[PDB]
Amino acid sequence: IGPKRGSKVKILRRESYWFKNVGSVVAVDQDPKTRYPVVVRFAKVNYANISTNNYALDEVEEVAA
Amino acid sequence: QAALYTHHQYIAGFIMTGAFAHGPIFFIRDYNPEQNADNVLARMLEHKEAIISHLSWASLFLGFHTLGLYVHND
Amino acid sequence: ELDPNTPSPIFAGSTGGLLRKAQVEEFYVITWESPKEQIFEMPTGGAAIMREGPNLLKLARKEQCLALGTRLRSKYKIKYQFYRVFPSGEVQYLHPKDGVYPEKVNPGRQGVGLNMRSIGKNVSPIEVKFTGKQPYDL
Amino acid sequence: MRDFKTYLSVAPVLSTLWFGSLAGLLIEINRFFPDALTFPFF
Amino acid sequence: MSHSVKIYDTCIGCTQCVRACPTDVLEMIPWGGCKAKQIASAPRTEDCVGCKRCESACPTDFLSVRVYLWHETTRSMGLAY
Amino acid sequence: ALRIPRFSQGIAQDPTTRRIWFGIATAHDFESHDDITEGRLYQNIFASHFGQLAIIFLWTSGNLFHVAWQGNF
Amino acid sequence: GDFLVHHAIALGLHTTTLILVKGALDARGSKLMPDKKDFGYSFPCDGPGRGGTCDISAWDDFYLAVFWMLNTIG
Amino acid sequence: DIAGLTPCKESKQFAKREKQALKKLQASLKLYADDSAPALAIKATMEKTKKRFDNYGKYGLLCGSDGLPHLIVSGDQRHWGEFITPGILFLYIAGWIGWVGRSYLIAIRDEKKPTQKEIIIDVPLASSLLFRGFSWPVAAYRELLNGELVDNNF
Amino acid sequence: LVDRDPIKTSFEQWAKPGHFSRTIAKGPDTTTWIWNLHADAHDFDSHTSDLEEISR
Ligand code: CLA
Ligand code: CLA
Ligand code: CLA
Ligand code: CLA
Ligand SMILES: CC(=CC=C/C(C)=C/C=C/C=C(C)/C=C/C=C(C)/C=C/C1=C(C)CCCC1(C)C)/C=C/C1=C(C)CCCC1(C)C
Ligand SMILES: CC(=CC=C/C(C)=C/C=C/C=C(C)/C=C/C=C(C)/C=C/C1=C(C)CCCC1(C)C)/C=C/C1=C(C)CCCC1(C)C
Ligand code: SF4
Ligand code: SF4
Ligand code: SF4
Q: Which CATH class is domain E1-81?
A: alpha beta
Q: Does E51 show up as a binding residue in the annotation?
A: yes
What is the C-alpha to C-alpha distance for residues A35 and A42, in angstroms, rounded to an integer?
22
| Partners of residue D37 in chain H, C-beta under 8 Å | 59, 61, 69, 82
Among candidates B29, B33, B34 on the partner chain, residue whose Cβ is nearest the Cβ of C126: B29
Estimate the crossing angle of helix B14-22 against helix G12-25, to 10 degrees.
20
Cβ E14 vs Cβ E27: under 8 Å:
yes
Torsion-angle region of H126 (φ positive above 0: left; ψ -120 to 50: alpha; else: beta) = left
H111-121 as b/e, with b when 16 or more CB fall inside 10 Å?
Answer: eeeebbbeeeb
3-state secondary structure of F43: helix
Taking the CB of residue E41, how many other CB atoms lie within 10 A of it? 23
Minimum distance, in Å, between the CA of residue C113 and any CA atom of chain A = 16
CA I20 to chain centre: 4
Q: What is the DSSP letter of H130?
A: G
Long-range contacts, stretch H48-56, CB < 8 angstroms, 24+ apart: H48/D34, H49/H22, H50/H18, H50/H22, H50/H23, H50/H25, H54/H8, H55/H8, H56/H8
Cα→Cα distances F47→B30, C111, F44, H81, Å = 23, 44, 6, 66
- Measured in Å, residue H94 CA sits from the centre of ligand 6 at 10
Which residues lie closer than 8 Å to H96 by C-beta, 6 or more apart? H132, H133, H134, H136
CA atoms of A6 and A29, how far apart (whole Å): 10
Quick one: residue E52, left, alpha or beta (phi over 0 = left, psi -120 to 50 = alpha)?
Answer: left
Query: Kind of pairing, strands C29-32 and C56-58?
Result: antiparallel
Q: Is the dihedral of CA C115, C119, C120, C124 positive or negative?
A: positive
In angstroms, the CA A26 to CA I15 distance is 30
Name the helix (H) or strand (E) containing B66: helix B56-71
CA C26 – CA F73 distance, rounded (Å): 70
Q: Which residues of G touch B51 (CB under 8 A)?
A: 21, 25
Q: Which helix (H) or strand (E) segment is G65 a member of?
A: helix G59-65
Is the separation of the CB atoms in A28 and A8 below 8 Å? no
Contacts of D7 (CB under 8 A, 6+ apart): H122, H123, H127, H128
Cα separations in angstroms, H146 against B24, H96, H99, H152, I19: 39, 19, 16, 10, 44
Looking at CA atoms only, how far is residue A55 from chain I in angstroms? 20
Distance CA B27, CA G38 (A): 10
- What span, in angstroms and rounded, lies between the C-alpha atoms of F9 and F22? 12
Residues C16 and C44 sit within 8 Å (Cβ to Cβ):
yes
Q: Which of F21, F29, F50 to mutate to test the pocket of ligand 2 (most atoms within 8 A of CB)?
A: F29
Cβ of H88 less than 6 Å from ligand 6: no
Cβ distance E11 to A54 less than 8 Å, yes or no, reads yes
H127 touches chain D (CB under 8 A): yes
Q: Angle at Cα B49 formed by Cα B46 and Cα B53, nearest 5°?
A: 145
**Residue H141 — left, alpha, or beta (φ > 0 → left; ψ -120 to 50 → alpha)?**
alpha
Is E34 annotated to bind a ligand? Reply is no
Q: For E5, how many CA atoms within 13 A lie in the half-sphere containing its CB?
A: 23
Q: How far is CA F11 from CA C137, E46, F21, G11, in A?
A: 18, 17, 10, 42
Contacts of G49 in chain A (CB under 8 A): 48
**Sign of the four-CA dihedral H31, H35, H40, H41:** positive
Q: Does residue C56 sit in helix, strand or coil?
A: strand
DSSP state of H79: -
Taking the Cβ of residue C119 and every Cβ of chain E, the question of whether any pair is shorter than 8 Å is answered with yes
Closest of G36, G17, G19, G18 to residue G27, by C-alpha:
G36
Q: CA E44 to CA E37: how far, in whole Å?
A: 20
Please, where are the H alpha helices in D1-42?
A: none
Chain G and chain B touch, per 3+ beta carbon pairs within 8 A? yes
Whether the CA torsion I15, I18, I23, I26 is positive or negative: it is negative
CB-ligand 9 contact for G49 (6 Å cutoff): no
Chains F and H touch (3+ CB pairs under 8 A): no
Size of interface A-I (CB pairs under 8 A): 12
Q: How many CB atoms sit inside 10 A of residue C45's CB?
A: 10
CB H123 within 8 A of CB D14: no
The answer to whether E52 contacts G49, with C-beta atoms less than 8 Å apart, is yes
Q: Is A24 helix (H, G, I), strand (E, B) or coil?
A: strand
Segments making up each domain of chain A, as ranges: 1-65
State the DSSP H helix or E strand holding residue C32, giving kind and residue range, or none if neither.
Answer: strand C29-32
CA of B45 to the centre of ligand 5 (A): 19
Helices (H), strands (E): how many in chain D?
0, 0
Residue E37: partners with Cβ closer than 8 Å, 6 or more residues away: E30, E31
Strand order in the sheet with C56-58: C56-58, C29-32, C80-83
Q: Give the distance from residue C103's alpha carbon to the nearest chain F alpha carbon, in angstroms.
A: 32
Rounded to an integer, what distance in angstroms lies between the CA atom of residue H121 and that of residue D11? Answer: 7
3-state helix, strand, coil in chain G (%, to 5): 40, 5, 60
Which residues, including other chains, have CB under 8 Å from residue H35's CB and lie 6 or more apart? none
How far is the C-alpha of A40 from the C-alpha of A62, rounded, in Å?
12
Binding-site positions of G for [4Fe-4S] cluster read 45, 54
CA-to-CA distance for F15 and F1, rounded, in angstroms?
7
DSSP annotation of B70: H
- Say if ligand 9 is within 6 A of residue G48 CB: yes
Q: Report which residue type is found at E76.
A: S
I16-23, long-range: CB < 8 A, 24+ apart: I17/H115, I17/H116, I20/I46, I21/I46, I23/A49, I23/A50
G18 to B12: CB separation less than 8 angstroms, yes or no:
no
CATH superfamily of D1-42: Single helix bin (1.20.5.510)
- The ranges assigned to domains in chain D are 1-42
Strand intervals (E) in chain G: none
Question: What single-letter DSSP state applies at residue C31?
Answer: E
CB E16 within 8 A of CB C103: no
Sign of the four-CA dihedral F22, F23, F26, F32: positive
Give the residue on C whose Cα is nearest the Cα of F35: C130
Residue A9 and residue A21: Cα distance in Å, rounded? 8
Report the nearest atom of ligand 5 relative to the CA of G20. 23
Spatial separation of the C-alpha atoms in residues A51 and E60, rounded to whole Å: 11
H helix runs in chain H, sequence order: 12-19, 47-50, 85-93, 140-143
Based on the number of CB atoms within 10 Å of its own CB, is B13 exposed (0-12), middle (13-18) or buried (19 or more)? buried
Residues of C in contact with B32 (CB under 8 A): 124-125
Ligand 7: list residues with CB < 6 Å. Answer: E 7-9, 11-14, 17-18, 58-60
Sequence-ordered alpha helix ranges (H) in F1-73: 18-21, 38-46, 57-63
Q: How far apart are CA H58 and CA H9, in angstroms?
A: 8
Q: Do E48 and C113 touch (CB under 8 A)?
A: no
Closest CA to B60 of G18, G55, G42: G18
Substitution target in G28, G31, G32, G35 with the highest count of E β-carbons within 10 Å is G35
Question: Does B35 contact C at CB distance below 8 Å?
Answer: no
State how far the Cα of D26 lies from the Cα of D34, in Å rounded to an integer. 11
- Chain C positions touching E48 (Cβ under 8 A) are 62-63
Q: Using a CB cutoff of 8 Å and minimum separation of 24, what contacts does H140-143 make?
A: H140/H95, H140/H99
Please tell me which of the candidates C25, C126, C130 has its beta carbon nearest to residue F36: C130
The SS3 of residue B38 is coil
Query: Closest residue (by CA) to atom 6 of ligand 8?
Result: E51
Q: What angle do the packed helices G12-25 and B56-71 form, to 10 degrees? A: 150
Q: Do A47 and G34 touch (CB under 8 A)?
A: no
Cβ neighbour number for residue C117 with a 10 Å cutoff: 10
Q: What residues contact residue D5 under an 8 Å CB cut-off, 6+ apart?
A: H128
- Residue C50 half-sphere exposure toward CB, CA atoms < 13 A: 15
Cα dihedral: B5, B9, B15, B17 (round 10): 170
Q: What is the CA radius of gyration of chain A?
A: 12
Q: Residue C30 forms beta bridges with which residues?
A: C57, C82
Q: How many CB atoms lie within 10 A of CB H129?
A: 21
Cα A61 to Cα C101: distance, rounded to the nearest angstrom: 42
Return d(Cα H71, Cα H4) in angstroms, integer: 10
Contact D39, D29 (CB under 8 A): no
3-state SS, residue C57: strand
CA H71 remoteness from chain centre: 15
Burial pattern F53-73, b for ≥16 Cβ within 10 A else e, equals eeeeeeeeeeeeeeeeeeeee
| Distance (Å, whole) CA F40 – CA C60 | 45
**Other chains touching D, judged by 3 or more CB pairs under 8 Å:** H
In angstroms, the CA D17 to CA D11 distance is: 10
The answer to whether domain A1-65 has CATH 2.30.29.30 is no
Give whole-number Cα distances, C64 to C67, C85, E65, in Å.
6, 15, 22
Contacts of C71 (CB under 8 A, 6+ apart): C41
Cβ within 8 Å, pair C126-G35 = no
CB atoms within 10 A of CB G36: 21
How far is B12 from F70, CA to CA, in rounded Å?
Answer: 34
Which residues in H52-81 are b (16+ Cβ under 10 Å) and which e? eeeebeebbbbbeeebebbebeeeeebbeb
Domains of chain H: residue spans and CATH: 1-154 (1.10.8.110)
Structural domains of chain C ordered from first start: 1-138 (3.30.1470.10)
Report the distance separating Cα B4 and Cα B6, nearest Å.
5
Partners of residue C80 on adjacent β-strands: C32
Q: Is F11 exposed, middle or buried (0-12, 13-18, 19+ CB in 10 A)?
A: buried
